[PDB]
């Protein structure tokens, strides 16, 4: 019966809440209250990559931390050289509606995807000299919101049909499908060891998914609205989510509960992108009040504002070597702050 | 200078890439993009058929104008999480079946969707080419089934001539930003070969209004 099962369902939820409350004895602020604050941090626009003629919707830094790709609504997938300004590749998309992009760890492949419900894998290193389509992954019944490359043959895609899927590029089929979400999955981030990943969805809950076992492992609630962004801590034992209620939250993998609440009274907009620093001290969040923000990830204080954009910030990314942070806004431009 | 041969050739390649990107953007700037947002398959397929997965795209040229219709209804997701991708569309071609007033009612849900689209933050100044599609079946069924089934407050007679006017005015009622948006209602027939003509007329009027607004005349 529905109520008969709901009885022990709510009993188990209460037991989980009681265990989470009993595992807490002190907040993160109470622990790291005696640490020297990071102080005010200044950021200057070192480079300004221009050339897009529409809204920029995603961006991913390469492993070498010099190449970066950007996806925009005009149908272009520009690959930038970030140390200089000049471009490398200009890939005309089949469908102009793209909301996510990715860069392979080996640098040979770049992904895309959007309202066409199809993830496209582009082979950059071709003998023929032009960027082709290596595979066109179909099988999602909703818009793709975030795709991340596991390796050169596996990609984890998160779609708007409340499902995340693990693919195989050569075969083209879904190796594993991660069910359990009730709202539209909006963002994705893999672990440093690429054996776990977390996905945030519109039902204000982020779940830890085992990419090898194939089922959800933990459930993290706490947000009051849609989770537009998510990112793992560099240690892999934590991750930070940015929701639509002007609040970034830090979750713990082993404590399995709240750690921090990075919210300010002067912001009522919605976080669109979240990324961490190399040492995990500076949590960068791209907000909807036209500028990015910097948060001390151990305290709750601010550190600086990356105010250099005309339209809102949609994508954020800190390089693998930790040198710079790039914010790509909705107007036309990506700015490489450092 | 202080650039080697490879950096100079890379700069030349990026210059050429930006040149073709600018050319493609200039080509796509003159091309009209229309959002076809119907309700419950109330004439989407018929409207697409009489002229010219995820997003269905249809492009057609009609007497020195390139149009682009984005059929959306095959999404079944949260509309507010991707409806901001359609900023800057020239018009929002709606589609409403008049015969669905006696089918909780389909016309009431059509009104709800029209209110949700008119009172939308992103579409605060985009005109709506409303298309009352099924008028023949409405004309045949209006003699037997009265409009009081759908509208208990109706005071008009049974004839289609004023019933269609009541439907049109009720559909224009839910508009709130009347100073920016203009709803170009039209009635579609089976033999109506001028639906694309009315789309062209409404799009030219929208373009003229946009040019007047940019020039300061409006």
């Amino acid at each position: 019966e529905l109520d008969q099962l709901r009885q022990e369902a709510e009993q188990l939820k209460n037991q989980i809440r009681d265990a989470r409350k009993a595992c807490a004895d002190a907040t993160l602020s109470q622990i790291t209250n005696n640490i020297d604050p990071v102080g005010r941090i200044q950021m200057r626009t070192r480079r300004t990559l221009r050339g897009h003629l529409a809204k920029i919707y995603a961006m991913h830094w390469g492993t070498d931390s010099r190449l970066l790709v950007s996806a925009s609504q005009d149908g272009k997938l520009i690959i930038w050289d970030s140390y200089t300004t000049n471009k490398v590749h200009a890939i005309p998309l089949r469908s102009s509606w793209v909301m996510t992009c990715a860069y392979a760890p080996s640098g040979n492949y770049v992904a895309c995807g959007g309202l066409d419900n199809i993830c496209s894998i582009y082979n950059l290193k071709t003998r023929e000299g032009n960027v082709r389509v290596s595979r066109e992954l179909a099988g999602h019944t909703g818009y793709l919101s975030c795709c991340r490359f596991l390796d050169d043959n596996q990609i984890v895609t998160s779609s708007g049909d409340t499902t995340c899927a693990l693919w195989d590029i050569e075969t083209g089929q879904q190796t594993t499908t991660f069910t359990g979400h009730t709202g539209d999955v909006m963002s994705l981030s893999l672990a440093p060891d690429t054996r776990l990943f977390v996905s945030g969805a519109c039902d204000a809950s982020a779940k830890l998914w085992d990419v090898r076992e194939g089922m959800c492992r933990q459930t993290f609630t706490g947000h009051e609205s849609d989770i537009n962004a998510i990112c793992f801590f560099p240690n892999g034992n934590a991750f930070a989510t940015g929701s639509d209620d002007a609040t970034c939250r830090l979750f713990d993998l082993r404590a399995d509960q709240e750690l921090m609440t990075y919210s300010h009274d002067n912001i009522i907009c919605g976080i669109t992108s979240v990324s961490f620093s190399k040492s995990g001290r500076l949590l960068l969040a791209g907000y909807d009040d036209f500028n990015c923000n910097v948060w001390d990830a151990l305290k709750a204080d601010r550190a600086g504002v990356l105010a250099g954009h005309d339209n809102r910030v949609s994508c954020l990314g800190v390089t693998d070597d930790g040198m710079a942070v790039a914010t790509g806004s909705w107007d036309s431009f990506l700015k490489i702050w450092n | 200078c202080t650039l080697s041969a490879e950096d100079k050739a890379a700069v030349e390649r990026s210059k050429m890439i930006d040149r073709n990107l600018r050319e493609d953007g200039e080509k796509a700037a003159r091309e009209v993009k229309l959002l076809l947002l119907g309700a419950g398959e109330s004439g989407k397929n018929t409207i697409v058929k009489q002229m010219k997965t995820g997003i269905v795209e249809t492009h057609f040229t009609f007497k020195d104008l390139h149009f682009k219709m984005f059929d959306v209804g095959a999404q079944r997701s949260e509309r507010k999480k991707w409806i901001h991708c359609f900023e800057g569309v020239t018009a929002i071609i709606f589609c409403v079946a008049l015969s669905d007033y006696d089918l909780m009612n389909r016309m009431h849900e059509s009104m709800k969707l029209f209110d949700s689209i008119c009172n939308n933050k992103w579409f605060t100044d985009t005109s709506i080419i409303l298309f009352l599609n099924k008028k023949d079946l409405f004309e045949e069924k209006i003699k037997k089934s009265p409009l009081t089934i759908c509208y208990p407050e109706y005071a008009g007679s049974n004839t289609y001539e004023e019933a269609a006017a009541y439907i049109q005015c009720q559909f224009e009622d839910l508009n709130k930003r009347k100073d920016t948006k203009e709803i170009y209602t039209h009635f579609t027939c089976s033999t109506d070969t001028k639906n694309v003509q009315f789309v062209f007329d409404a799009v030219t009027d929208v373009i003229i209004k946009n040019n007047l607004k940019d020039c300061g005349l409006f």
Partner: single-chain antibody
Amino acid sequence: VQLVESGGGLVQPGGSRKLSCSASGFAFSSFGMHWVRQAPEKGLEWVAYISSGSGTIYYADTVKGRFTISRDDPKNTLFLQMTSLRSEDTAMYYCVRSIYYYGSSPFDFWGQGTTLTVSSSDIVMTQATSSVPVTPGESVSISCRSSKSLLHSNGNTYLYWFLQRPGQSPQLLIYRMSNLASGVPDRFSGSGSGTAFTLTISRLEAEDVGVYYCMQHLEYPLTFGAGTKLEL
């Protein structure tokens, strides 16, 4: 990919001949193309270069003004209209594709080349060895010394290695002195810094028998090296 060559033959001194290099298979419009001559008894030598989209165009000091080079992206053909022939132009002309972006491999594929028989501040690179007898399975080191250090302020030495098996066109082995070209075995390994460069072969087989050349790529008057022929 393919680059089939048409032209050559007996040309009188002071005449004119027109060499057609018709690409087939790859994106010819995105590829800067070169020409590389080779005398019947000497090493390789540079000729000219057109950037992508017929932009910048350079020439060697010897062939400046006499040679004109053009491309036709419609037909995927690229030409070399050369004037004022003499006995010094008796060579075999390879057209070499080269695409320049960050991380690319210029000079990766070489055309077949047509021989041309005529009736009767450059960074010099020195390879003192000209013939190294060796047995298969023995590690071989081939040294290349320049006159000016190729290490630009960016941090990459623009030195290139090539291998010319007897009877076929050269192929890129090492690009930028420390990067393996795609399609070659992993035994090859180039190294060095400044003006002294060496290439270390781990294991040798029967297909490694061939001449080994050098390219500088700092400024566009590129100078080849006296090829150190490898043989058993």
